[PDB]
Design brief:
- The structure is cut from a larger assembly and holds one copy of chain A, three copies of chain B, two copies of chain C, one copy of chain E and one copy of chain G.
- Chain B is an alpha/beta fold.
- Helices cover 52% and strands 9% of the residues of chain B.
- Chain B is built from 14 helices and six strands.
- In chain B, strands 2-1-3-4 form a four-stranded parallel beta sheet, with helices on both faces.
- In chain B, strand 1, helix 2 and strand 2 form a beta-alpha-beta unit.
- Chain C has one domain: Orthogonal Bundle (Bovine Mitochondrial F1-ATPase, ATP Synthase Beta Chain, Chain D, domain3), CATH 1.10.1140.
- In chain C, helix 1 packs across helix 3 and helix 1 crosses helix 5.
- Chain C starts with 5 loop residues before the first helix and ends with a helix.
- Chain E has a five-stranded mixed beta sheet with strand order 3-2-1-4-5, sandwiched between helices.
- Chain E has two domains: 65 residues, Orthogonal Bundle (Helix Hairpins), CATH 1.10.287; 200 residues, Pyruvate Kinase, Chain: A, domain 1 (3-Layer(aba) Sandwich), CATH 3.40.1380.
- Chain G has a four-stranded mixed beta sheet with strand order 1-8-7-4, with no helix packed on it. In chain G, strands 3-2-5-6 form a four-stranded antiparallel beta sheet.
- In chain G, strand 2 and strand 3 form a beta hairpin.
- Chain G folds into two domains: 84 residues, ATP Synthase, domain 1; 33 residues, no CATH class.
- Classes of the chains: A alpha+beta, B alpha/beta, C mainly alpha, E alpha/beta, G alpha+beta.
- Chains in contact: A-E, A-G, B-E, B-F, C-D, C-E, C-H, D-E, E-F, E-G, E-H, F-H.
- Chains A and E meet through helix 1 and strand 1 of A and strand 3, helix 4 and helix 6 of E.
- Strand 1 of chain A pairs antiparallel with strand 3 of chain E.
- Chain C: This is ATP synthase subunit beta, mitochondrial.
- Chain C: One of its GO terms (biological process) is proton motive force-driven ATP synthesis.
- Chain C: Keywords: ATP synthesis, ATP-binding, CF(1), Hydrogen ion transport, Ion transport, Membrane, Mitochondrion, Mitochondrion inner membrane, Nucleotide-binding, Phosphoprotein, Transit peptide, Translocase, Transport.
- Chain C: It is found in: Mitochondrion; Mitochondrion inner membrane.
Chain lengths: 48, 337, 116, 85, 265, 120, 120, 253
């Protein structure tokens, strides 16, 4: 597990007295997908 | 405006509103209206007659009727004949309003006469002197001088646009001859904004020169707000500036407010309050669905709380700072309930 | 195609189709640039712009007026020249090269002229 | 043209642009109508071609949208792919 | 007809005009938020650059590229493509990771050999740490980023609020961090694997910045493009208006002639 | 005007209202007279009739009339024959605009649309 | 100065005292500190500017005292008060998640965050 | 070209330049120029006369006049009469020029005459014999043969396009009769090119031989080059090649 990925999961957990904003929620929710490729050839666009 | 978008209804509404002043004994408050039904089918004129009788308006009404069946010479001379009727009222120093509806059918009749009499044809197969005909009719409307006894003969011709062609020969001519236009727009009518007046394409070249002083005061803003609302209308298509959103809210409520049920007139003393609320943005708080409820309620609330205010508006005809103060308070109180 | 031969007809068909595409997207091209065309189409358009320009040829009786020595190109040569161009076998050289010249060989030679 | 169109029971519009497009017959499928309609074609051919008209009409609609640009959903691009064929 | 065919075509041009106006305006709205974000992001990045500068640097290659999924963001898509293609000459066999559909299309066409990773769901969103982190994680695992002794990322630097110059930068490998001239003026701890951590940390921190710079240029480009579109549409309005006017005069004359001919009999 | 200029030795300036309505009036008199109307339904005497009007307004040795005329462009189509024929006679145009008046400038003359023959 | 910053937001970007939780344990920086590179671990952070002290909950990041007395702190999404009670509820959920659950690493982080919360 | 692009001035300059030629010796070098003013205000004509007398050029030129005031039949007969005067010079073997300003105004005149003769209206309401009217006028004025003593009578008829409509009936009919065009482009006129000659719409379909050899050698292919400039700036509005840029720098300059 990469260091910045490690920090990332911690950051996601961290968006949970309370004081909540949209930019935070957006910073912790993404709908992006990553499409693996080979050759041309394309293994699927697995959700990021 | 566009063909049979209930143009006749818009006109008929004016006649009904004249009942309020007409009932009033002062003869400087009596416009004796004349409706000139040109080319209108007898069934339609029967409905007109019935509507007038229902609203008991047949006592300041004269209806000169040249129906569809009636012969093309009768149709030709029908507005001219009508005009003479208007002259008696005007000559007597009285006031009256003559509504020629619609000059488009007058045109067709003149066309029929000229072509059948083999007189030289002209543009759009309309008679060569058709400009001259329309101008003669439309120039008889006159606000007299006091030496010739102050009288008037207000007129409001209704012109049928042949699907929206305002460049068409008979429309262009008439537009030039008259001074002012109110241009009803078909899209609005279909989209349920009735009256379907397109504010942009409505102009008055006499306009505010005659207008209740009170009603002028609280409605300079209204013209400007609507102007902004139109421009920022298309900007509804997402990422919306706070400024645009303020315009949109105020503008949408205003547009909703100016809807009015046909064949129901209103008094100036009840026009002035409704507009006051909108101008002061009180209506912004009120939701669109509740605009309608607000309107009638506001009027009843105003009548209950202070029909003194209403009576002052009616009689004074000029909004005093004290009235605008008191009115604002009344509106605030109404908005709260 | 039975008259001018299948090969001619096929060549001509492709010319007509390409140019018609170019005319169809003539509107789109004006409203938004060439880089806002679809990639497949953008090739068609670039080729077609060349084809259109290729169609001009100097005329010898106009040699006085235009000032360009005319070019009479054989019919057999014409079919060949366009055939190649449609397969993009010379698409790689200036649009100016295609403009006002004779045969395909002449376009090539003028590419050398332009290259200088 | 106005007089004849009224008199006749169908129109089989051809279109010059489509001729150039290489569609020969150049029949402009949308403008072409048969007001005597299907009950004159082979029963078999009626069965197979049932939604062919709908597909072509959809292709025309989709194509218009497609030329105003922007990425189209896959369902629309199914139409586009089918339509082309 | 001439008259109706003119009139409908002019209406089409009108509708096109209206849309291009609308888009340009909405783009301006979107642009303000985008720009605000980019400042804050850039401030964070500068602190990281402060280390890399003072340390000095002294680094096959990796290519990462950034564009939106969204189209009609001017010539961002193809100007960036051209500068990638130029550096695809430089290192032939390099594996291109295309972050965004638009850059994916141009490069994929020019060499379909190199496409190994490509992303999706980029353009719609404004870049956030979450996206960058996951992409980074996938670059490390999938592309084995350290294996390439050069790493380069391409993006669009938003030169002016009306311009964009496509730009690239080199991400320094974990090897680089080790052998950088100064690294001992900062107190390295052998206990931590600070190169192996910092490499990862700056992989994402730099990439997020690249995405932010790019995103601002993209939204800026769309605004610019849609503005120029309105202008082009305006020119067509004028051209068809003249056509309308001419056609209109002609219809009146031609109709008149028919009436006259009849009258003459 | 001619009495003032020619016979009282004056320089005077004579306003005309819509010169569209000059044309319009002329068109009617032709049609009534039964002449075959010309293009866009305008009098076949269109050239000559404007010519008479626009040739008695001139710079004489004695004096000069000068005329400010109003062009109520028909359908705002400046390629229409009636505006065009008028424009042929016109020497300068002073182009009052409502935008300009809205910038509080009275004169209302739009500086970028006002152009004159003498301005060289 | 002190650079304390997040990507989307930017804070103090040497400041009097900064107290940092690092892979080297805990590190304190007071005025000039000799120039270090330290990875910041998920943290409870104190930044004091003068005697005034501000208390931060930090998602880890990187710390680098620059030789010119620039304490570059870069971290993802932080406040301490913002993190707080809802987190206590989450921690119960997170324990459940740890049971089932890269998923291992996620669960490890969940335990870390739970600890980090206990520090609050 | 387009109405009141000071259309007259372009022609006027031609008349002025020939002062040096006309003040020469050899009747071949002398041109005798006739300016037919049809449909012009008496004021406008008075300015022309004064302009010519300012450039002291009046002595080599005739003005035949059919002002706006003058009656429509006089206007109809106006170019033909002028052309008769011209033919006397031509058939004196002497070189000459006749500038017919504006045959477009002759068209309106013939329209009036024809319609008032109640001859059926033609296309665009311009009479049906309008082609004959212009053609009979136009094909008179000629460079005659050695047999006829090498006469010349150059013809420049000045056509007023309505809104730059070059497909318009009166203009097209003239264009087909005449050779070459000297289209005066309105856009360029506005954008300060004086004289505003759009080389794309200006051709001379018989001109190249006429030019003196020096001005063929030095000016060789400049028409092509500046019809490359039109193309260059056409597509100036993606990747501009250094070649394109060089052409643009030269072209604009």
């Amino acid at each position: 597990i990469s260091y910045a990925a490690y920090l990332n999961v911690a950051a996601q957990a961290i968006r949970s007295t309370e004081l909540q904003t949209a930019s935070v929620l957006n910073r912790s929710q993404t709908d992006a997908f990553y499409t693996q490729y080979k050759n041309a050839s394309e293994p699927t666009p697995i959700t990021k | 405006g566009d063909r049979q978008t209930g143009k006749t209804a818009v006109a008929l509404d004016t006649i009904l509103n004249q009942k309020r002043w007409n009932n009033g004994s002062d003869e400087s408050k009596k416009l004796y209206c004349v409706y000139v039904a040109v080319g209108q089918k007898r069934s339609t004129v029967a409905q007109l007659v019935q509507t007038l009788e229902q609203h008991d308006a047949m006592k300041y009404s004269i209806i000169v009727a040249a129906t569809a069946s009636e012969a093309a010479p009768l149709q030709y001379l029908a507005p001219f004949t009508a005009a003479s009727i208007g002259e008696w009222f005007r000559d007597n120093g009285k006031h009256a309003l003559i509504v020629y509806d619609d000059l488009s059918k007058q045109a067709v009749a003149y066309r029929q006469l000229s072509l059948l009499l083999r007189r030289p044809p002209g543009r759009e197969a309309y008679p060569g002197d058709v400009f001259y005909l329309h101008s003669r009719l439309l120039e008889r409307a006159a606000k007299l001088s006091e030496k010739e006894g102050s009288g008037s003969l207000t007129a409001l011709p209704v012109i049928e646009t042949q699907g929206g062609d305002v460049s068409a020969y008979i429309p262009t001519n008439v537009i030039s001859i008259t001074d002012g236009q109110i241009f009803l727009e078909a899209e609005l009518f279909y989209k349920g904004i009735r009256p379907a007046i397109n504010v942009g394409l409505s102009v008055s070249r006499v306009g505010s020169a005659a207008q209740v002083k009170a009603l002028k005061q609280v409605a300079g803003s209204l013209k400007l707000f609507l102007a902004q609302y139109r421009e920022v209308a298309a900007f509804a298509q997402s990422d919306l500036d706070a400024s645009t959103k303020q315009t949109l809210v105020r503008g949408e409520r205003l547009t909703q407010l100016l809807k009015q049920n046909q064949y129901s007139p209103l008094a100036t003393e009840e026009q002035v309050p409704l507009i006051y609320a909108g101008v002061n943005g009180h209506l912004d708080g009120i939701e669109l669905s509740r605009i309608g409820e607000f309107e009638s309620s506001f009027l009843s609330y105003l009548k209950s709380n202070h029909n003194e205010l209403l009576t002052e508006i009616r009689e004074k005809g000029e909004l005093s700072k004290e009235l605008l103060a008191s009115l604002k308070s009344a509106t605030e109180s109404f908005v709260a309930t | 195609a039975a008259v001018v031969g299948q090969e001619h007809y096929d060549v001509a068909s492709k010319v007509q189709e390409t140019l018609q595409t170019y005319k169809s997207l003539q509107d789109i091209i004006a409203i938004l640039g060439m880089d806002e065309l679809s990639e497949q189409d953008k090739l068609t358009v670039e080729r077609a712009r060349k084809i259109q320009r290729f169609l001009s040829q100097p005329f010898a009786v106009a040699e006085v007026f235009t000032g360009i020595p005319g070019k009479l190109v054989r019919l057999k040569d014409t079919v060949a020249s366009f055939k190649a161009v449609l397969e993009g076998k010379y698409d790689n050289i200036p649009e100016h090269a295609f403009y006002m010249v004779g045969g395909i060989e002449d376009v090539v030679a003028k590419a050398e002229k332009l290259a200088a | 043209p106005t007089n004849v169109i009224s008199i006749t029971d169908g129109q089989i519009f051809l279109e010059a642009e489509l001729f150039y497009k290489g569609i020969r017959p150049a029949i402009n499928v949308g403008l072409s109508v048969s007001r005597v309609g299907s009950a004159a074609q082979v029963k078999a051919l009626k069965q197979v071609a049932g939604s062919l008209k709908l597909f072509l009409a959809q292709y025309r609609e989709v194509a218009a949208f497609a030329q105003f640009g922007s990425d189209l959903d896959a369902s629309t691009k199914q139409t586009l792919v089918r339509g082309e064929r | 007809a001439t008259l109706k065919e003119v009139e409908m075509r002019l209406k089409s041009i009108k509708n096109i005009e209206k849309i291009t106006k609308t888009m340009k305006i909405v783009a301006s709205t979107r642009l303000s938020k985008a720009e605000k974000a980019k400042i804050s992001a850039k401030k964070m990045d500068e602190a990281e650059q402060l280390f890399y500068k003072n340390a000095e640097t002294k680094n096959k290659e990796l290519i990462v590229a950034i564009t939106s999924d969204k189209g009609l963001c001017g010539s961002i898509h193809s100007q960036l493509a051209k500068a990638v293609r130029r550096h695809l000459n430089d290192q032939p066999n390099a594996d291109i990771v295309t972050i965004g559909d638009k850059i994916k299309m141009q490069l994929l066409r020019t060499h379909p050999n190199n496409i190994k990773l490509s992303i999706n769901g980029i353009g719609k969103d404004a870049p956030t740490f979450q996206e960058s982190a996951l992409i980074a994680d996938k670059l490390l695992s999938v592309m084995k980023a350290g294996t390439y002794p050069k790493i380069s990322i391409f993006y669009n630097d938003p030169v002016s609020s009306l311009s964009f110059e496509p730009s690239e930068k080199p991400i320094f490998n974990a090897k680089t961090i080790e052998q950088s001239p100064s690294f001992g003026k900062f107190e390295i701890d052998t206990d931590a694997n600070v190169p192996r951590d910092l490499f990862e940390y700056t992989l994402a921190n730099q990439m997020l910045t690249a995405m932010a710079q790019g995103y601002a240029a993209e939204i800026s480009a769309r605004r610019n493009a849609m503005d120029n579109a309105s202008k082009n549409a305006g020119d067509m309005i004028n051209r068809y208006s003249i056509l309308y006017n001419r056609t209109r005069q002609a219809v009146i004359t031609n109709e008149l002639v028919d009436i006259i001919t009849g009258a003459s009999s | 005007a001619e009495y003032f200029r020619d016979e009282e030795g004056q320089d005077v300036l004579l306003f005309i209202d819509n010169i569209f309505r000059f044309t319009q009036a002329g068109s009617e008199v032709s049609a009534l007279l039964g002449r075959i109307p010309s293009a866009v339904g305008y009098q076949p005497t269109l050239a000559t009739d404007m010519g008479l009007l626009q040739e008695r307004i001139t710079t004489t040795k004695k004096g000069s009339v000068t005329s400010v005329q109003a062009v109520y462009v028909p359908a705002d189509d400046l390629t229409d024959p009636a505006p065009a024929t008028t424009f042929a006679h016109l020497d300068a145009t002073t182009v009052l605009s409502r935008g300009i008046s809205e910038l509080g400038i009275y004169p209302a003359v739009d500086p970028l649309d006002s152009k004159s023959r003498l301005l060289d | 100065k002190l650079q304390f910053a997040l990507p989307h937001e930017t804070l103090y970007s040497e400041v009097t005292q900064v107290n940092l939780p690092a892979k080297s344990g805990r590190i304190g920086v007071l005025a000039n500190h000799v120039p270090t590179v330290e990875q910041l671990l998920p943290g409870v952070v104190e930044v004091m500017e003068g005697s005034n002290s501000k208390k931060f909950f930090i998602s880890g990041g990187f710390a680098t005292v620059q030789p010119d007395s620039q304490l570059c702190v870069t971290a993802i999404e932080a406040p301490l008060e913002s993190f707080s009670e809802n987190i206590k509820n989450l921690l119960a959920e997170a324990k459940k998640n740890v049971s089932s659950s890269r998923e291992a690493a996620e669960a490890a982080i969940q335990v870390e965050v739970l600890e980090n919360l206990q520090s609050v």
